[PDB]
Design an enzyme around this catalytic site. Sequence first.
Site, PDB file in Angstrom:
ATOM      1  N   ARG A   1      -0.146  38.548 -41.924  1.00 19.92           N
ATOM      2  CA  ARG A   1       0.856  37.866 -41.108  1.00 19.92           C
ATOM      3  C   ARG A   1       0.195  36.974 -40.055  1.00 19.92           C
ATOM      4  O   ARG A   1      -1.028  36.983 -39.872  1.00 19.92           O
ATOM      5  CB  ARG A   1       1.781  38.888 -40.428  1.00 19.92           C
ATOM      6  CG  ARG A   1       1.077  39.981 -39.620  1.00 19.92           C
ATOM      7  CD  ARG A   1       2.097  40.947 -39.002  1.00 19.92           C
ATOM      8  NE  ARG A   1       1.447  42.030 -38.281  1.00 19.92           N
ATOM      9  CZ  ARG A   1       1.025  43.158 -38.842  1.00 19.92           C
ATOM     10  NH1 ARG A   1       1.182  43.365 -40.143  1.00 19.92           N
ATOM     11  NH2 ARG A   1       0.428  44.081 -38.099  1.00 19.92           N
ATOM     12  N   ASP A   2       1.030  36.179 -39.383  1.00 18.61           N
ATOM     13  CA  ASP A   2       0.688  35.505 -38.131  1.00 18.61           C
ATOM     14  C   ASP A   2      -0.208  34.289 -38.340  1.00 18.61           C
ATOM     15  O   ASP A   2      -1.350  34.261 -37.857  1.00 18.61           O
ATOM     16  CB  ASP A   2       0.010  36.488 -37.170  1.00 18.61           C
ATOM     17  CG  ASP A   2       0.855  37.717 -36.886  1.00 18.61           C
ATOM     18  OD1 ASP A   2       2.043  37.722 -37.266  1.00 18.61           O
ATOM     19  OD2 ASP A   2       0.329  38.680 -36.275  1.00 18.61           O
TER      20      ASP A   2
ATOM     21  N   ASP B   1       7.411  38.604 -29.415  1.00 18.20           N
ATOM     22  CA  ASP B   1       6.381  37.593 -29.690  1.00 18.20           C
ATOM     23  C   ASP B   1       6.866  36.198 -29.315  1.00 18.20           C
ATOM     24  O   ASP B   1       7.910  35.742 -29.786  1.00 18.20           O
ATOM     25  CB  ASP B   1       6.000  37.599 -31.173  1.00 18.20           C
ATOM     26  CG  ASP B   1       5.299  38.856 -31.602  1.00 18.20           C
ATOM     27  OD1 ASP B   1       5.514  39.914 -30.973  1.00 18.20           O
ATOM     28  OD2 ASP B   1       4.528  38.782 -32.585  1.00 18.20           O
TER      29      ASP B   1
ATOM     30  N   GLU C   1      -4.372  41.449 -34.746  1.00 19.67           N
ATOM     31  CA  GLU C   1      -3.163  40.640 -34.809  1.00 19.67           C
ATOM     32  C   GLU C   1      -3.190  39.307 -34.127  1.00 19.67           C
ATOM     33  O   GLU C   1      -3.996  39.069 -33.295  1.00 19.67           O
ATOM     34  CB  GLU C   1      -1.973  41.412 -34.226  1.00 19.67           C
ATOM     35  CG  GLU C   1      -1.806  42.834 -34.700  1.00 19.67           C
ATOM     36  CD  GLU C   1      -0.404  43.367 -34.425  1.00 19.67           C
ATOM     37  OE1 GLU C   1      -0.185  43.940 -33.406  1.00 19.67           O
ATOM     38  OE2 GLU C   1       0.476  43.180 -35.243  1.00 19.67           O
TER      39      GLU C   1
END
Length: 411
Positions: free
Chosen positions: A198-199, A42, A283
């Site tokens: 997340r993220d 990432d 995501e």
Amino acid sequence: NYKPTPWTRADALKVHSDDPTTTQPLVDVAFPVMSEEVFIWDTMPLRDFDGDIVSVNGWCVIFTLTADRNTNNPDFQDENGNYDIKRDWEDRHGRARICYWYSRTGKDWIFGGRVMAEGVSPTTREWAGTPILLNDEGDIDLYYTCVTPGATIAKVRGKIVTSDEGVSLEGFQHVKSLFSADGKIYQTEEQNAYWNFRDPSPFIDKNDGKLYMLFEGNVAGSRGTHEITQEDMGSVPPGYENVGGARYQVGCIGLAVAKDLSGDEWEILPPLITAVGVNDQTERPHFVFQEGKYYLFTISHKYTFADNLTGPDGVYGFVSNQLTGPYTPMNSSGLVLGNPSSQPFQTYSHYVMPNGLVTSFIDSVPWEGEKFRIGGTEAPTVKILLKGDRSFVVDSFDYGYIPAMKDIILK
Ligand SMILES: [Zn+2]
Ligand SMILES: [Zn+2]
Ligand SMILES: [Zn+2]
């Protein structure tokens, strides 16, 4: 206030792999690797609060999830005593640390090392988020995810300093934990041991002047209990009513709003997109703001689609005239840039920047026989054009080419 927009089963039935206008070019199986010492995956370019990629005193900067290559570590040898790269690469998630790289050209990145000293992060794992350049004194807030125990969106403030020789990051010492899944809007670990949370991707909306953030979540509720509604189905064609175990796929793009522009306190809001019955993983959500439109991108997996649906690994997207919707799927199905079917896992974590450039990392490329070559290095950058609710692949660039859109002179 507003209702989430479902990405429906009917939408997903339109997903088409190997559409050349929405397919990443084939990665060379003999791709080069940027480091023989570390894996990266990432990648998070330095940006401001609207999405613009920014360089500092002429230096482009990227943050990466990073782990050591254990080429000579006996703990990662097979029984013969030979380095097992597959085991090493697949264990990276428990070793993830955030590092930075810099370059004046946007490519041929120079390694800068760790953002945080070991021990600063509440969790040993440092998972993905967004580095925001806050001002032209060089202050940076790294929003990221603290994982295991739990999953917590956090931020840490530091500073960037430049010279004629390169870039240094300093002062990233104090992690502020912001929030975790709540259980009423977003699913918790107690509700689902495999929950996604997340993220973070912060942004300011100039229409109301407020600081918001996107993040990956799941629709709240005990695992396996979610009801698939007609709104989740969409207008499916005759014969496509069997959803199998689709109730176990409950991904969503979450939203939160800060109490003020310091971003130290957050209010969790309803998600912008929900994919109940469609896909468990939306995501790394991120915006491109273009022509007054809200282009909302997210990255997903072929194998997180619900039963009797499918699509390629890659980036999916939605567009709206308003922050809170209604959103309509890009290219009718949602698919913006999918991997080619002959190399379906060649790249992942595809990040669309407002200049149309899309970066990703190389994951696994077919090699010989049933063998695979592992990447852990940047993929060639793709350029797409956004036209209304459609997108078109139009060009390709060098491995890891991530230039800035504007340069910030530090005071
Ligand atoms: Zn900007
Ligand atoms: Zn200033
Ligand atoms: Zn995948």
